[PDB]
Symmetry: C3
């Protein structure tokens, strides 16, 4: 049973690939948390003047930009150019959606490096190969990030020198340059001079600190969710994301996701999280701090208290329109029960039954206890 | 190969979990018939004043009510209250729809117990965990029905006292009660005074005690089906159900389900069934009695001859719009054939071929042979 | 890991069944390429006056007629008769769409034997049984093509005489005839007197040389593809196909399917094919010749150079709207990339980057190298 998790742990990467203009880190997809989850996590960071060479995966991918600014371009097959296809800019808090098998390249021009953390849902209907994550690079000899877990060069360097020569219609010499002969993130010495501004579908939506949050409480913090309702290209991925920023000691109530798996990646600070399963067992009772990830499976209950000012996280849910069941708060599940059945399922009295329903008037985030 | 079954048998429950005001019976979901099917059956009977405590599952659920009258309520996350959300009434014959993760509760008030037989489609696309059935109870300390198969407390009892005090904003004492400290089906001493009557979606459709049978033969019986067509909440589940009443010795023609898995549970009487596979092997040739279940895989063919007045059954099919291919009778696949191809594939004469296409005028149900 | 394929090979069939009026060949569905592709391939052949007795399967099928002419009939459950349901005539180059579970019969009257190569998508969502291919014949005592791999009689010959009797309302004499008491393909001595002209939807479309192609280069050849845009019954199958003819020494560029697996069947001639994976390994390099099959996974990259006048193939894609990403061509992925980024990923000088974007001005198909 892939999802019979005994104990979850704040996971951190087990693979660092240092490249010329950056670095790529990946989390093991063969751990029972990720196997249960159905995702492959990774965190790519590009420095000044670095370009992440074009590549593609066989699954839905969702990229969240932790820090920095740059530009990115998709190479969508049935689309028109301009010379070249469309290029979008991006900032911190941007959620980029990458449809199955589509190729892209990303570039950074500032001193502040781009830190992009992403997920490939390898258990998608669209992924027709097997659960193993894999990336297909267009150019350059270097082994793909997920090769380590399988057990190189790019797709073009694998052909025969005469087949490139024949296909592209060029000579032996530039056919050798194309045929492989630095890694995925190379440094564009002077800098890519390319202008800074489904084919017309927007694949960039901002959920980070620069938005109009869904839930806002000036004493507890705020939450901003991006479903396919507000970012229509997400329905093409069947993926979502959530950004939260909690004030020290404020907490998000116990809640479960009715239809999605969550992968909570901590952006800043630290938190005391608690998650419990179908058998009442508390499968995690600890701290999740910056750069670590906690996986909460489908109907498991989650609650967190902030130990920082502020504790920020990104939550990749595996459903483009995730529904969450709240267990405490203005709109809780207990709030919708008859007071009388609340009395008989929890063994309380009518008065106490009123207290569970009405003592906490806040939706999802609750302020510091004020002690 | 889960469905490469050699011999089907009428299955019984292997788990009884007596509770204060009721009982819970569950069939083993690891026997190959059920692995092939992708469901998990369960029969919950609730005596007078029994309140089944709030719970939810990680998969679509469909409840047929074999006997009794009660009230049931679903706590749907995005929904408006009235105090509390909607309370629906039910009668024997009703089909209750339960979308993945939605929490519900049930109550009975009359002497005649409620017996509700139900299936959880663990093989659903909305089941992002594993093929293990699981119930997540919002209250009470008790081992959930399926824990036996896996190898307790509620989801709220797994949390630290400090966390529940904060989340609900209540004192230690009431927080202690909420945190556990009679099993799933409890008894309400005085009885609930709660008013006997998507957030709009009708999720109750009567298929047993109706008067609008899909097919009706006064000399053979009747059969009713409830598809999404007439019960739209069912497209949320991708599940269906059929109710049939068969007179002694009457029969339902050899047939198959093109796009679904049937789980036939006998509600009354007995009947002689025959089910044959792609190889011509008779994988089951015996009788199916009250309270027993026979699984007929996807394109396997089934035929039944009644042995009681009447043999009633509910067949849960795994598709909200199942399609059956009747092999004998008014709209049989052989009727739609050319008279000449039926002659050459069956090796019959022109005259005989006419009899197979017209001797039985009846649709699905065929009257007793008259001996 | 099913699709973690090392070396591919042009596969030829392992099973063969000489029927009265024909022959049936089937490829082993438990080979790793087919295990990975999720399909079963079979080549049936009807000689003159041959009839294929009605049968069905647990999954979408897509038949392509290599050669010959004849008529076929599909027995759809709720469809109206005319005496019998509607008949359609087929010609070579036709692609017939058969829904999951639907039954169909096939007849050939010219001397010229019909050769039809088809696939069953066992990995479908419609397939609720297991990864085994299995045909369910309505008549005749013979063993189902695929039994061999699983390790007979039809679905009627398994039933008891008195059940069949009561079912069709007949006499033990024809009931016995009916109960099974010449294989799947049976020759009709005089030959059917049947004419030669969802219930109305078109389930036949020609993708043969006769049709207007999607690509036609007078020097390279031509390509025709049938999606659900131009043949909507395929949106039910979630399958599609592609016919291609290639002049000697011409070639189709290196490309990959973004959203589908492909099963290349060599109709005529021989070619030299190469396919490389995500690591950069040419997992195949040799020649796919007539009557052989090459499975090319999802994002794997293929390239073929014709060795005949002309190499003709049928590519079975597992998606009704397959998106292809061409790597060299007028339309190519590199063409959308800025000149400067194709400079930096491929270590090229500007003028060399322009040469890749423009030397080859053709879509998909490139003429012979001109030697």
């Amino acid at each position: 049973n892939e999802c019979q998790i005994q104990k979850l742990n704040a996971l951190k990467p087990d693979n660092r690939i240092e490249s010329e203009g950056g670095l790529i880190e990946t989390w093991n997809p063969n751990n029972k948390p990720f196997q249960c989850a159905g995702v492959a996590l990774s965190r790519c960071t590009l420095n000044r003047n670095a370009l992440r060479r074009p590549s593609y995966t066989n699954g839905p991918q969702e990229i969240y930009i932790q820090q920095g600014k740059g530009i990115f371009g998709m190479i969508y097959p049935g689309c028109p150019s301009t010379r070249h296809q469309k290029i979008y800019n991006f900032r911190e808090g941007d959620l980029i959606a990458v449809p199955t098998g589509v190729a892209w390249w990303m570039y950074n021009n500032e001193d502040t490096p781009v830190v992009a953390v992403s997920i490939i849902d390898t258990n998608s209907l669209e992924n027709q190969l097997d659960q193993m994550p894999r990336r297909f690079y267009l150019a350059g000899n270097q082994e793909q990030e997920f090769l380590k877990y399988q057990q190189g060069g790019s797709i073009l360097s694998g052909f025969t020198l005469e087949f490139l020569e024949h296909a592209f219609s060029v000579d032996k010499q530039i056919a050798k340059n194309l045929q492989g002969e630095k890694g995925a993130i190379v440094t564009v010495k002077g800098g890519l001079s390319v202008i800074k501004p489904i084919c017309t579908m927007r694949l960039r939506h901002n959920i980070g600190q620069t938005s109009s949050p869904d839930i806002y409480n000036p004493q507890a913090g705020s939450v901003t969710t991006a479903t396919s309702l507000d970012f229509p290209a997400l329905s093409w991925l069947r993926l979502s994301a959530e950004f939260g920023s909690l004030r020290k000691n404020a907490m998000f109530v116990p809640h479960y996701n009715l239809n999605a798996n969550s992968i909570i990646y901590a952006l800043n600070g630290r938190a005391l999280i608690q998650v419990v399963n179908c058998n009442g067992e508390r499968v995690f009772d600890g701290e999740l701090q910056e750069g670590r990830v906690l996986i909460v499976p489908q109907n498991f209950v989650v609650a967190a208290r902030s130990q920082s000012d502020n504790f920020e996280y990104v939550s990749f849910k595996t459903n483009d329109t995730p529904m969450i069941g709240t267990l405490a708060g203005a709109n809780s599940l207990l709030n919708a029960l008859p007071e009388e059945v609340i009395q008989h399922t929890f063994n309380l009295k009518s008065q106490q039954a009123r207290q569970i329903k009405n003592n906490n008037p806040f939706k999802f985030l609750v302020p510091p206890q004020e002690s």
